Every structure is written in C-alpha cells, then in structure tokens.
C-alpha cells in the first residue's frame with residue numbers, strides 16, 4: 242500500500258531530498274511514498290522495461306525529451322485533470338507545456354516537475370588575469386573565439402593546482418545527447434530535424450547546421466580544448482572544472498547549488514572555482530541566441546493500482562510550494578512559471594543569469610522517434626570528435642558524416 246516513485250539523481254542525496262519533500266503529502270494522505278533512484282545512464286532502459294512488462298512504479302520521472310517515446314507505447318495515464326488543477330496551459334512556458342504530451346496527441350501524459358537550461362560557467366579570476374571582458378567574450382561567436390585566444394595566451398595558474406587552465410572544456414567522448422552541440426547548430430540558423438510536407442526529416446546536413454557544428458568542433462581543433470578533454474565524458478569534464486582545470490564550461494543551473502555544498506557532501510564549496518564562479522549565456526550566433534532548455538516531468542503508469550493517490554501526489558509535486566522547495570534542494574528551476582518569482586531564485590545573481598537566458602531557451606520536438614534520432618546523431622558526432630582528436634575534421638568530412646547521420650535518421654523517422 243506504499244506509493245512507489247522512480248527518480249533520477251537530481252540532488253546530492255537524491256532519495257533523502259525526495260523523502261523530505263513528500264513528508265507533508267504522506268502525513269496529509271496517511272500513506273508512505275517509496276522512492277527508487279535510477280542513474281541517468283540506465284534510467285531509460287529500466288523505464289522502458291517497466292513500460293513493456295507492466296511491472297514498475299506508480300510514478301516515474303522522465304526527462305522532457307523522453308515523454309513522446311514513452312507516451313507512444315500507450316502505457317501512460319492521462320493527466321489533463323492534474324494540469325487543470327495546477328492552472329492549465331497558462332501556468333507554464335510554452336517550452337515547458339509542449340513536453341506534457343507526445344506531439345499532436347490529444348491528451349497530456351506528463352506533469353512538469355522541474356526545468357533546466359544551459360549556459361557557460363566561467364572562472365571570474367582567470368578571465369580578469371587574461372584581460373577578457375566577459376560581456377564581449379559571450380556577446381558573439383567572434384567574441385567567444387577572441388576570448389578563448391586571450392585565455393590560451395594567459396600566464397594565469399589555478400591557486401590550488403598551480404597549473405594553467407584549459408580555455409574551454411567540452412567532452413569529446415561519444416555523447417549521450419546533443420545538449421552540448423544543439424546551441425551551435427541553432428545559433429547558425431540550423432536544426433536537428435525540420436517539419437515540412439507533413440513529415441519530419443534530418444536537417445543536421447543543412448548548410449546552417451554544418452556551419453554551427455564545424456564552428457564548435459573547430460575550437461577544439463584550434464587549441465582551445467585540450468587533447469585530454471576529447472577523451473572525457475560530461476561528468477569527467479564537470480569534475481575537471483570543479484578541480485580548477487577549465488576556465489569555461491557549459492552546464493545547467495544545478496552546479497550553482499553544488500558550489501555551496503562541501504566536497505565531502507558531493508559539492509565543491511572548498512574549491513577555487515566555487516569561490517570565483519561566473520555564469521554567462523551562450524553567445525549570439527549568426528542567426529540569433531539559443532540554448533538547450535529541458536528538465537524532467539512525472540508520469541503515471543496506466544497499470545498502477547494507486548492512480549487516485551498517485552494523481553494527488555502529481556498535483557502536490559506540480560504545485561507552488563513543492564515546486565519552490567524541490568528547486569531549492571536540486572539547484573534546478575521550477576517547472577511552474579509562478580514559482581520563478583521566489584526570491585531564492587531572483588536574488589541569486591548566478592541563477593538570475595540562467596533565468597534571463599530562458600528567453601532564448603529552445604526545446605526538441607516531442608516526437609515518438611526522438612531517442613532514435615538523437616542516438617544516430619550522437620554516434621555520428623562521436624566520429625566527428627574522433628577526427629578532431631586527429632586534427633583532421635574538415636568541412637568535407639563533417640558534411641560526409643552528417644549526410645550519413647541524415648540518411649539513417651530519415652530511414653528511422655519514415
């Protein structure tokens with residue numbers, strides 16, 4: 242008679258934080274909530290195994306980009322009633338509302354839980370020593386490359402590591418997602434997929450998509466990303482920025498919360514980076530400013546034996562008080578627009594920078610096939626990183642890889 246909820250690791254002690262969050266719900270409803278944490282690397286497989294077997298929790302977290310795929314399997318309970326109780330369409334950013342459903346579907350299948358978007362963390366101390374004005378460096382693509390050139394030339398050394406800092410750390414290992422690449426594709430005027438003629442097709446091989454992708458990967462090729470970074474994944478690069486190896490690195494808003502937590506508690510409060518932390522939005526590309534905007538939603542399996550209490554929990558987790566409290570514990574942003582006004586978010590100057598970048602937030606379409614698109618894109622992007630690791634990424638070779646990515650994506654989408 243326990244409600245069961247599956248979550249990902251959204252906070253340093255993620256189960257304890259989730260239990261603290263729901264204790265008022267448990268007391269008001271006379272029920273216990275049992276939480277299971279799934280690592281982000283394995284969550285998709287465990288959630289899809291529950292969807293196919295009918296054995297699983299009442300509720301699951303879903304990354305926003307997963308909602309279409311899980312909804313298309315016909316295993317999610319409608320939640321238009323819950324979203325109505327929370328304020329309906331009006332209560333959310335369009336970028337958040339669009340993740341409540343499979344695109345074109347009638348009925349919502351997911352409740353917004355938290356939002357996140359990407360921006361650049363930078364070392365305030367390293368840019369000052371390099372003579373870089375952050376407002377110029379993060380204005381434009383030309384600004385960004387000029388600032389990296391100045392950071393490469395800098396004699397600055399981290400006070401702890403006593404060594405120079407990489408201008409930019411970005412991972413070169415085959416990525417799990419396009420989160421890092423997408424702003425450069427978009428800033429150039431391109432897109433991952435495009436809807437035309439009542440079908441979706443790859444646009445990764447568009448002149449504009451190839452422009453942004455080449456710009457981004459050539460920064461590594463030009464000496465602004467150290468060879469060692471190419472051999473790392475996102476978690477390893479995050480550790481490198483925290484350990485004082487990187488002047489600039491792109492991530493979500495949670496690293497602000499982690500900068501106030503001791504290392505022994507899973508943050509980096511003691512590190513120089515934590516004490517010299519800036520944030521700047523992605524620079525304007527040729528065709529405008531964009532960043533990846535995502536987050537997580539909650540879904541109810543239609544095979545749950547506790548749908549009535551599970552919907553009350555969704556209403557609780559989706560509502561103002563729990564919205565504020567969980568974003569405070571995780572370092573994410575509320576999903577619910579009203580909750581953004583809390584002074585805990587507005588008066589935090591680093592998080593305010595994320596708040597202002599949300600105007601340029603861009604999302605993926607909520608497609609049934611999205612996983613398969615992203616998986617083919619990332620496997621080809623990996624091959625392009627391997628060329629960067631040889632100094633052999635040319636425009637010709639990047640186009641050849643993206644034409645192959647585009648053939649396989651169009652096959653999958655058909």
Ligand SMILES: OC[C@H]1O[C@@H](O[C@H]2[C@H](O)[C@@H](O)[C@H](O[C@H]3[C@H](O)[C@@H](O)[C@H](O[C@H]4[C@H](O)[C@@H](O)[C@H](O)O[C@@H]4CO)O[C@@H]3CO)O[C@@H]2CO)[C@H](O)[C@@H](O)[C@@H]1O
Nearest residue numbers: 250251252253281304305306307357418495507535536537
């Ligand atoms: O693509 C699916 C989905 O992605 C969402 O973005 C997720 C990322 O997928 C995920 O890798 C990222 O994970 C963070 C996590 O939130 C932090 O809590 C975690 O914090 C760590 C800490 O940084 C570590 O030092 C320590 O080891 O433990 C704690 C956690 O216990 O750091 C990781 C690493 O980046 O979280 C992203 C935001 O949820 C998108 O939002 C969504 O749209 C996509 O659908």
Ligand SMILES: [Cl-]
Nearest residue numbers: 416421422622
């Ligand atoms: Cl990438």
Ligand SMILES: [Cl-]
Nearest residue numbers: 432433434605
């Ligand atoms: Cl896109």
